[PDB]
Amino acid sequence: AQYEDGKQYTTLEKPVAGAPQVLEFFSFFCPHCYQFEEVLHISDNVKKKLPEGVKMTKYHVNFMGGDLGKDLTQAWAVAMALGVEDKVTVPLFEGVQKTQTIRSASDIRDVFINAGIKGEEYDAAWNSFVVKSLVAQQEKAAADVQLRGVPAMFVNGKYQLNPQGMDTSNMDVFVQQYADTVKYLSEK
Numbered sequence: 001a002q003y004e005d006g007k008q009y010t011t012l013e014k015p016v017a018g019a020p021q022v023l024e025f026f027s028f029f030c031p032h033c034y035q036f037e038e039v040l041h042i043s044d045n046v047k048k049k050l051p052e053g054v055k056m057t058k059y060h061v062n063f064m065g066g067d068l069g070k071d072l073t074q075a076w077a078v079a080m081a082l083g084v085e086d087k088v089t090v091p092l093f094e095g096v097q098k099t100q101t102i103r104s105a106s107d108i109r110d111v112f113i114n115a116g117i118k119g120e121e122y123d124a125a126w127n128s129f130v131v132k133s134l135v136a137q138q139e140k141a142a143a144d145v146q147l148r149g150v151p152a153m154f155v156n157g158k159y160q161l162n163p164q165g166m167d168t169s170n171m172d173v174f175v176q177q178y179a180d181t182v183k184y185l186s187e188k
Contacts, residue, residue: 009159012158016144022056029069030151036151060077075109084117
């Protein structure tokens, strides 16, 4: 076939019921994730090709960067609760991997302050049990699906994207092949 199990995607031996339709995992410590977000704009190009009705979920993971890794998962929870993903994603990536100015929870906080979220609003979210459960959700989703590597994308809790099986000579072509694969899996 043109799309084949084990080539552009793999199948989960143990499907995850009730899972989000398109589910993406990343880490601000993850070098390919930096690429996926700032150079390739994967999440975005997947959206542009998804059917109508399909929601996209993106979660942070704990297994990179130890203690700060966990802080970042909580901050991503804050970002999701406040609806400011599109304002902190880039400064967080660059603060961790480009400038290396993010070294503590306080530095993570500075990124939000500079993006214009008010301190009181950030600290209140940070400490909220809405954010605790949003952290819980991120962890549970990663736990449900084997997850020991990022970037990762899952479609309907049953298929997992396999970017190693796509040509990377051309970045634009890689992205489209990726997005089309998601759309194919989506319609499956």
